[PDB]
Amino acid sequence: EEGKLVIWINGDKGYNGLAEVGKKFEKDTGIKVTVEHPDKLEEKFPQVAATGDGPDIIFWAHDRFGGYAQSGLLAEITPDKAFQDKLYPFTWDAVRYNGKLIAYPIAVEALSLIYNKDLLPNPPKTWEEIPALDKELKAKGKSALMFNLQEPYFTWPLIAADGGYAFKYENGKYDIKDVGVDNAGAKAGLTFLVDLIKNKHMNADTDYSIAEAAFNKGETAMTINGPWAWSNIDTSKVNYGVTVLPTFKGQPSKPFVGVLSAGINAASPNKELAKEFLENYLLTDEGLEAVNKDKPLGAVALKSYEEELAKDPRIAATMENAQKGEIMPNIPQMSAFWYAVRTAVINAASGRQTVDAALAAAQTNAAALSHQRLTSLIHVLEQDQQRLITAINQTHYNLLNVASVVAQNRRGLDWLYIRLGFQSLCPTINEPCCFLRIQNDSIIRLGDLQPLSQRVSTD
Amino acid sequence: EEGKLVIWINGDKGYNGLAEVGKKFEKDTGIKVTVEHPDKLEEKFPQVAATGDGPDIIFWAHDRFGGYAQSGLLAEITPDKAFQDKLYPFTWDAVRYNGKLIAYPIAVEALSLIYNKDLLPNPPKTWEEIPALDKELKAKGKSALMFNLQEPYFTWPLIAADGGYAFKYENGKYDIKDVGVDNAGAKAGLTFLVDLIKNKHMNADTDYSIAEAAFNKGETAMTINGPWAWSNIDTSKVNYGVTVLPTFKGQPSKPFVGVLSAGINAASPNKELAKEFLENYLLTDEGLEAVNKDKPLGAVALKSYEEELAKDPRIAATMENAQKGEIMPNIPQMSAFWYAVRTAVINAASGRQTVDAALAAAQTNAAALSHQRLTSLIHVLEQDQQRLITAINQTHYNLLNVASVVAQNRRGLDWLYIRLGFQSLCPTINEPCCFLRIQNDSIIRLGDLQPLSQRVSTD
Amino acid sequence: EEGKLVIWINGDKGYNGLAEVGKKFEKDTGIKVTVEHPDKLEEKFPQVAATGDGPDIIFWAHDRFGGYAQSGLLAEITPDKAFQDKLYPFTWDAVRYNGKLIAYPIAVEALSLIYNKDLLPNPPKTWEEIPALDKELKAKGKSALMFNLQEPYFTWPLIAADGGYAFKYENGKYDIKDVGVDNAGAKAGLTFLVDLIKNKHMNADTDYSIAEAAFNKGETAMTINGPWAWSNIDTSKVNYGVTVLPTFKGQPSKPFVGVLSAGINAASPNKELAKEFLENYLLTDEGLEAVNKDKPLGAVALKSYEEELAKDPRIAATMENAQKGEIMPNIPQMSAFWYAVRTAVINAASGRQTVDAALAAAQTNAAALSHQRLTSLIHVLEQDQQRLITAINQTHYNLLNVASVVAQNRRGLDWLYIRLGFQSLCPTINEPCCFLRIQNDSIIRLGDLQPLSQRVSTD
Lengths: 459, 459, 459
Ligand SMILES: OC[C@H]1O[C@H](O[C@H]2[C@H](O)[C@@H](O)[C@@H](O)O[C@@H]2CO)[C@H](O)[C@@H](O)[C@@H]1O
Ligand SMILES: OC[C@H]1O[C@H](O[C@H]2[C@H](O)[C@@H](O)[C@@H](O)O[C@@H]2CO)[C@H](O)[C@@H](O)[C@@H]1O
Ligand SMILES: OC[C@H]1O[C@H](O[C@H]2[C@H](O)[C@@H](O)[C@@H](O)O[C@@H]2CO)[C@H](O)[C@@H](O)[C@@H]1O
Ligand SMILES: [Cl-]
Fold this sequence. Notes:
Largest sheet of chain A: 7 strands, mixed
Keywords: viral protein, hairpin, chimera
Number of domains of chain A: 3
Bound molecules: a molecule of 2 linked components (GLC-GLC), chloride ion
Assembly: trimeric
CATH class of the largest domain in chain A: Alpha Beta
CATH superfamily of the largest domain in chain A: Periplasmic binding protein-like II
Number of strands of chain A: 17
Largest interface: A-B, 60 and 50 residues
CATH topology of the largest domain in chain A: D-Maltodextrin-Binding Protein, domain 2
Subcellular location (chains A, B, C): Host cell membrane; Virion membrane
Oligomer: homotrimer
Protein name (chains A, B, C): Env polyprotein
PDB class: viral protein
Shape of chain A: globular
Number of helices of chain A: 20
């Protein structure tokens, strides 16, 4: 592991293009670079890193990096002044935590409205016109809009539009106790979304893959997604545009803006190699181009290459949406916020909770990293109890099966004894009879249990 | 469910009288009203309401409504100025939360001392005289005092008398971090109560039903209860009075005063029908009278009807005790407070904990809604582990039973083989013998486990 | 239990000498005194005391007593002015909590460097010289240093040296939210220690017993321990000295100073007997001498006897280290702090976590008594799940064993039926055949579960 590099990046990004940068590094230096894209990497990273494992370099939007740093998992990076000047200062702000740089910023990501120019020459300026737009499109076997409803990143622009917010920003400092997921703006936003589902303009089950396939197959007029998605739309040959997100109550949708960033694992014995790879290889016009040609990065942090990329109307639209949204905080509590909003949106979308109760609970859960932890614990314990009860049940049925064969064996022993002219088995061998007797009251008592979450609230 | 009303109210209130109001509503409008009184309604409500179920209207004392509102579960009510003027302003204060009305107030409830005039013509002015009073009554086969020891509502007046308090009220705002369940006043109060149990003037097991039956049967000279209880005493024909609660250390007992209130479920598609039922039907002299004749409501919020009720010496006594106690907060943390005091009082009463350790723990638990949650979780997990271990144990014994029949079957197979002049089973069929071999070290290791609560504290 | 005394004291202290004081008490008064030294007494005490059990008198360093008092478990002690003057005021400060005395102080304990004068005539002034010292000692079949790595008390002096601290002390008041276990000083301290283990100058598994035996057997040049340990070194006949702890980065090591103290259980019906035992018997030159001759107490609180003890160069060294360290807080949060640092040090020492991730987690856990509680809960639940799964697994294998005998019984039934000229069992008795059929998918699904802690973090 010393003398080589392992890099993790998300499965929706240009990892094959990044591997080409790794191949050039290897060509020039002899150093092997391996790029992986595990699932749930943003959750896997802190677990493996804490034990001194995990990759040398970790790529994610900047919002998770404050927590990683607070947890002891990141090396402070040491770019000199000349390198720092190569990148936009606002990108350096995104990766600064308690005064220290904790990652290299790569690219600015914001969500936009992506629309099919052949189905919809002139896309809606407002969210409110969508149901009527969907009505007409449905008559022709299409739909107006499909996007990932399973990740709150995609719904947040709408929730934020009328006033919803994560943590209040005042005096240059986020207040972790002031959360705006349950104010009037947020409620209106999510109610409008759940209204779309109620009136069957969207489906609660739609996830990344489903929306992408529908848009890329010409089935839906619009989707909501980031620069990474453009590559596959090009391949699909759909005639698409990338524009400003619809307004809600006359207010701009407010995407949470992410800076794709690369951190160095505090436990890496390859911190200098990682620095040189990121600074001398990836963060160059040629390194970034290789990644971008694979899956587009968005508006890159590197001024020299961004000056070219900026002339792309897709990148102009990206930055227009960015300017309307807000840069994500990188505070450790961002993971509690996302977990809470994720739970709210899914619960509300699927009709398992009301909008207002979903959001009230999110408000509580976002307002403490320990709050979600308790929520997560009870959720996981509830699952474990069901797995335990299931195993206990199956063993019971297994035992009943075995008993059935034992009973047949006993009947066969008796029949034969009698047929050969003895008494039945037990008086013949002169033993008190052993009878099958199975108690099941315990098993029945387990099958009665309401789920753990309910029983904890009802105590 | 649209076009009809479902109402929940507690099993100790006039629900048959409320159903008569529902019947009149149905007569005038065609709208069916169904009144239910499930057990634990105050705990069932928030669970079903959060999923968009539960009743249209929920009745409880006002203290729980802040939490329900904070959780997204209540509609703001919209009574006009003319209706608002019909009710006392202090009752409207009880149902106001973060500036909004969240329920209709119905009636003011306070606990009083109810005494048997034939056993006790002149009831005690002080708690301290009770043991000597009980001494003499016991000589004649009676007791001085019996009341519900399972619900802290009933013991709180005593605990509060010498200085105990829930949340500190200053600057018109409750301090959730300043809790007075473990100060000197509170300790003295609960010690005096546990002293009554120690010296056998009361029993820790006495609950609502036991006290009510004893008083109503003429077995005990005194009880502590609310206006709802009077109805059944009338039926019993006991000659009773309703008076000021005894003093403790020369201080008035301080009942936590409740306003029976009716909220509208945020998820009800019948919010206007509910408004009209509460405003045009229940909150009238005739609506309230129908409920009151069933079980007395106390001092009603409706000025017109209260002006009659006030002439009742029982209602005068009720309000004298109310004025000496304090209006309950309606803050979300009230449920943590009640849970904590409930646990303390029962633990101390039953001698499972010392007064001082019981109250110290209550202090901690009341000082955070998340604190009780952890306490409740561990309590529930401890129960679940025991249920799991019990099932695991019974399956083990089931398996031993099955094995016993299998062993007898094997002995019978061998005997017969030999009797028919073969060798035993296994050399005859030419197989290595399979032997019953049951491992039980796991089962024994489970039977060794101290309860979860102890093991978590001892980690 | 009324009319006798039960005393708990730790197994490393002079409990046989304390029992001699108990015997003198019994001789003079008739009152039986029983001294016990259960394991984990500091954790057992609060559990048994809360139920009104446990000893009359509890001995521990003063740091745990604030929590015991806050939990309702200690009697305020009532020494008069004349008795108070017998002991140093700073010892009385150690046992004062929210303005009240909650224990009798006995003796001041600080860790020192204990060295073998024959292996090491001139012990190191610095931690940094130890690896080179160990290098040379190892060549002669010895080692430089061995001390208990399982209890953070012993490692803290080093962690504190360069700036690590527990709770920030300002304005005479500890800030429970300002914890210094994860600052630069603390990280450097623990990194140096783990570096010693990496480079094999110490072993992560070394505990109290192992270090004591190695030093007392002449195998290692140095150990770190308190006055109690001297007694067994005397017995060993090793030629030892007791000196100032090594410096780290030119800074003194900073032992957390403990005052061995004796509290009276709030639930004791023997509070006056306990007072008289502690004041009239133990806290005398003769009482303390009896304990000290068993295992040395350190610098005693009793001025009269300390004036003699102070002339001991071992006691001078003890107090030099004390003055360089700091008196422990007695705040309730000390137990969360010790639990957190214990976990960090072991995790880092054993290489299960990195120094930086270990300490970051400790920082979080020390910063709330409820934080550790959640950590402890998940740790205990993880263990319980494994015990449950193990039992579920063994029952499965038990059932497979039983099934194997049942299958052999069936084969023997068939063979015999056929041999006696019938058909096989089932067509002969004219029954559909029952077959053994065991489902195991549940069991396999349980064997797949990652540990609970990981799954809760990954939710
Ligand atoms: O859905 C919550 C999720 O949102 C963001 O993740 C984005 C990411 O920033 C983009 O690069 C892209 O991969 O889509 C992701 C959503 O699936 C946050 O960065 C992440 O922390 C958060 O969990
Ligand atoms: O015991 C705690 C309990 O007290 C109060 O409940 C009262 C209620 O207000 C009365 O209407 C009557 O029904 O007796 C109840 C006690 O059993 C609080 O209102 C309730 O929130 C709390 O849990
Ligand atoms: O290791 C943490 C532990 O440290 C202290 O315990 C000391 C004790 O003070 C000494 O008398 C001696 O017995 O060694 C102990 C360490 O094993 C704290 O007093 C204790 O609260 C803490 O858990
Ligand atoms: Cl069998």
